[PDB]
UniProtKB/Swiss-Prot annotation:
Disulfide bonds: none annotated. The gene is cas6f. It comes from Pseudomonas aeruginosa (strain UCBPP-PA14). This is CRISPR-associated endonuclease Cas6/Csy4. The keyword Magnesium does not apply. Changing residue 150 to A: Cleaves pre-crRNA 8300-fold slower. InterPro entries: CRISPR-assoc_prot_Csy4, CRISPR-Cas6/Csy4_sf. In this bacteria, Y.pestis-subtype CRISPRs do not confer resistance to phage DMS3 or MP22, but instead are required for DMS3-dependent inhibition of biofilm formation and possibly motility. Changing residue 31 to A: No pre-crRNA cleavage, still binds crRNA. Does not support formation of the Csy ribonucleoprotein complex. It comes from the Bacteria.
Length: 189
RNA sequence: CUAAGAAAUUCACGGCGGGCUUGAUGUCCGCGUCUACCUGGUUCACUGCCGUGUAGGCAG
């Protein structure tokens, strides 16, 4: 509903990295060279998203502000690797604005982190917390929640997103220092 | 609508004593294996400090 300043990002297909790898590289570059000095308005929804085939990211769409894009796209934390993807263009916000509140948050993924929490500041049974981790115990994003991770943990990327309901309503909220929404986002369409 | 039809069939047990297989021996001669390569395999569709109810900001 409030996707006035709109932009897109298309990572071109090449044999030097996967589409999820290119999306993770673009997301890490945006999180390092967009919320480096801070900021308020950052909206990064799936501009070419399809959450039915289990693919969380294969296209980028930015719904940000005017001054947030006039000074948030001219740094070396964004440029440099522009030989795979391309630049963007500005577009106005139409009357059709679905309230797709896109966020940048986490989800429950610890199958033994409850035991660490009980040992640190809980005083709970750590053996039952370790043995209480079945396949039907973890409840994370089973839809395409693309987790662009780093080279610190061997475990693969689970869900890290705050998606909203796509309808004909309006829902906007406060953007964080990483390109998300803390109660809503800009439009998507 | 089976070449239809049907059947308790058995209880017991000491294998054992003994022995010289031995003598002798030349396996030899020769050889071209070679050409090319993306493992990002995700090395569990995952490991972690807020309340051990899906309830958090990191070079994950």
């Amino acid at each position: 509903m409030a996707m006035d300043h709109y932009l897109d990002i298309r990572l071109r297909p090449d044999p030097e990295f996967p589409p999820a790898q290119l999306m993770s590289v673009l997301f890490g570059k945006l999180h390092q060279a967009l919320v480096a000095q801070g900021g308020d308005r950052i909206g990064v929804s799936f501009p070419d998203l399809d959450e039915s085939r289990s693919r969380l990211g294969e296209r980028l769409r930015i719904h940000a502000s005017a001054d947030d894009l006039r000074a948030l796209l001219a740094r070396p934390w964004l440029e440099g690797l522009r030989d795979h993807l391309q630049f963007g263009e500005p577009a106005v916000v139409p009357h059709p604005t679905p309230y797709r509140q896109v966020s940048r948050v986490q989800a429950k993924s610890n199958p033994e982190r409850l035991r660490r929490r009980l040992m640190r500041r809980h005083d709970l049974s750590e053996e039952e917390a370790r043995k209480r981790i079945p396949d039907t115990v973890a409840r994370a994003l089973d839809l395409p929640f693309v987790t662009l991770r780093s080279q610190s943990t061997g475990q693969h990327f689970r869900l890290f997103i705050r998606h909203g309901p796509l309808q004909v309503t309006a829902e906007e909220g406060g953007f964080t220092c990483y390109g998300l929404s803390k109660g809503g986002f800009v439009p998507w369409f």
